[PDB]
């Protein structure tokens, strides 16, 4: 039977990432090419992860996709571009047989919806990576992930990751690369403060309105970001927390400034976001040092960076300024509670905001996508349908 | 022994002043352009009395005595007294000054009124921009009626950093202004200290002042000259958002708009979309209150929309100019949002004249003794 000339199911996981130098605005809407480079921190899959199973079989009648147990239209443009690009690269042996088969894709994630995380970024990084497994595609997959969602390319790598905007109109150099591994800065901690607040402007549609109407955005991309990429890279390389934190806050605030300069304006921060920002600055002022950073994506949730040794105290300050309407306040990494000094208490807001923060997801820097090797991990049954 | 009482208007910048190039002389990083609001609805009243009997300068605001040694107050008094001698006993007289206003802008009308009233008492003729500006930068814009530019000036001595009227108050008689006073909120950074932080830390601010505002001044001027409401409206909203963007880009950031401001912004865009044209514009100063510009024929409808989206708390919602109420169409209601008591009340007004000397029909804010009555 070895003398004759010539199904597969693979399940992978992928991380979410948080941009510290923000992507906002495309120079090419079709190829998903950005007006500036971006830089993010990959969060640990121990706490947050997308899982995707890809099966191919000679028996599958059609291409079919599910997200969190619900079937979605296989024909979505971003999804079609992703699949087209992985097939292109694979061609760029069982391979032809493999390609002849319809695909069945099923994915899930463990992100609370209120968490407002980039499910799309992790989702397309996982899709690209799992398709690459199925089709035996070696080398960088940025071009595949990016077509699904721009920032998805940054979830292809662990640690600290840059998406290089690229110079080429075909997008071949618009790719992600690791700046430093997830073991580079083990003391770094990330706290996602999920706020009680809500339909936000879609970031795809929104950022294109900004490209069209914000003059500050153009100045930002042309004259600010390239040099910021370099400073932020150096802070990360040097484990310079104060430099990292200051640049992180500034680039977040600048991004939201360009949203406000958009016509009509886009506003993601709310009054709770603004109270979190004030808490962060007050906490730092009390310590006389930059101990904590915030950054905000396309919504009001605050993403906090701090060092392991500051986590307990800062969580106590959050509880003080936003007395929680839950006893389960801290999800993910646990730290023993600590009491705030009288001096810090009086430096914080006199009138707190009970329930402003729904809960905190506590996590750390983590690895890139991973292949799962357990039979039971597959989100599709033998039939190639969800279980 | 002379007592004079004048009033001065508030003004709303449509091309925003934000950031000084010279903190001492109060010279701005860009020119600004404002609409003078009518003193029949909003005004500062100031009485100045001059006498041999007064041993020291004394000043009251809204019934409360204030420290005359305030740097801005001293700068204003110094400049007027310098000019008083130039035009010419009384150059050595001390003054008692009392002012009141009907406000929820304030320092602009306050210093425009002080400069104007001191000029009356001291007999000072000609442009008072520099006197008012030294008290508060935007105060020079309240010296003229209608549509007024504060020209940033090219001279280091600041003598050409002055206000000039672009068009008089009768130029665009259909224009109306609604101030939406939002429910009380905690006060964010003061604007003098705040804008200086922006000069020190915002890169977007430098680009704005150098590369955006000079062109917008010209575009705005043209829209005003042509009574082009849609052009005027779009620029007004854009420049307000840009101003607040540079605040967000400051380190640490300054955020004057709140969730209510945000909801008013969304009401304006939805209202305009429903109508298929720009009917209404917003602009915000250094706080969450919305200033709305619209034409006379749209006021009633828009007031009804505000009422709908922000149901008033139970206890007169429309102050100032009165317009008969209308009901919103089902189509518009459906297109809008709501927030109960978000808006405390609305002040409606129109474009108005510069400062005015009051006749003796009105009582002075000081009695015969030169003290508040």
UniProtKB/Swiss-Prot annotation, chain A:
InterPro entries: GHMP_kinase_C_sf, Mev_decarb, Mev_diP_decarb, MVD-like_N, Mvd1_C, Ribosomal_Su5_D2-typ_SF, Ribsml_uS5_D2-typ_fold_subgr. Keywords: Acetylation, ATP-binding, Cholesterol biosynthesis, Cholesterol metabolism, Cytoplasm, Lipid biosynthesis, Lipid metabolism, Lyase, Nucleotide-binding, Steroid biosynthesis, Steroid metabolism, Sterol biosynthesis, Sterol metabolism. It comes from the Eukaryota. The keyword DNA-binding does not apply. It catalyses: (R)-5-diphosphomevalonate + ATP = isopentenyl diphosphate + ADP + phosphate + CO2. GO terms for cellular component: cytosol. The keyword Cell inner membrane does not apply. (R)-5-diphosphomevalonate binds at residues 23-26, 78, 149-154, 204. GO terms for molecular function: ATP binding; diphosphomevalonate decarboxylase activity; Hsp70 protein binding; protein homodimerization activity. It is an enzyme of class 4 (lyase). Disulfide bonds: none annotated. Pathway: Steroid biosynthesis; cholesterol biosynthesis. One of its GO terms (biological process) is cholesterol biosynthetic process. It is found in: Cytoplasm. Its EC number is 4.1.1.33. Homodimer. Catalyzes the ATP dependent decarboxylation of (R)-5-diphosphomevalonate to form isopentenyl diphosphate (IPP). Functions in the mevalonate (MVA) pathway leading to isopentenyl diphosphate (IPP), a key precursor for the biosynthesis of isoprenoids and sterol synthesis. Belongs to the diphosphomevalonate decarboxylase family. This is Diphosphomevalonate decarboxylase. It comes from Mus musculus (Mouse). The gene is Mvd.
Curated annotation (Swiss-Prot), chain B:
InterPro entries: GHMP_kinase_C_sf, Mev_decarb, Mev_diP_decarb, MVD-like_N, Mvd1_C, Ribosomal_Su5_D2-typ_SF, Ribsml_uS5_D2-typ_fold_subgr. It is an enzyme of class 4 (lyase). Its main location: cytoplasm. Keywords: Acetylation, ATP-binding, Cholesterol biosynthesis, Cholesterol metabolism, Cytoplasm, Lipid biosynthesis, Lipid metabolism, Lyase, Nucleotide-binding, Steroid biosynthesis, Steroid metabolism, Sterol biosynthesis, Sterol metabolism. Belongs to the diphosphomevalonate decarboxylase family. Catalyzes the ATP dependent decarboxylation of (R)-5-diphosphomevalonate to form isopentenyl diphosphate (IPP). Functions in the mevalonate (MVA) pathway leading to isopentenyl diphosphate (IPP), a key precursor for the biosynthesis of isoprenoids and sterol synthesis. This is Diphosphomevalonate decarboxylase. It comes from Mus musculus.
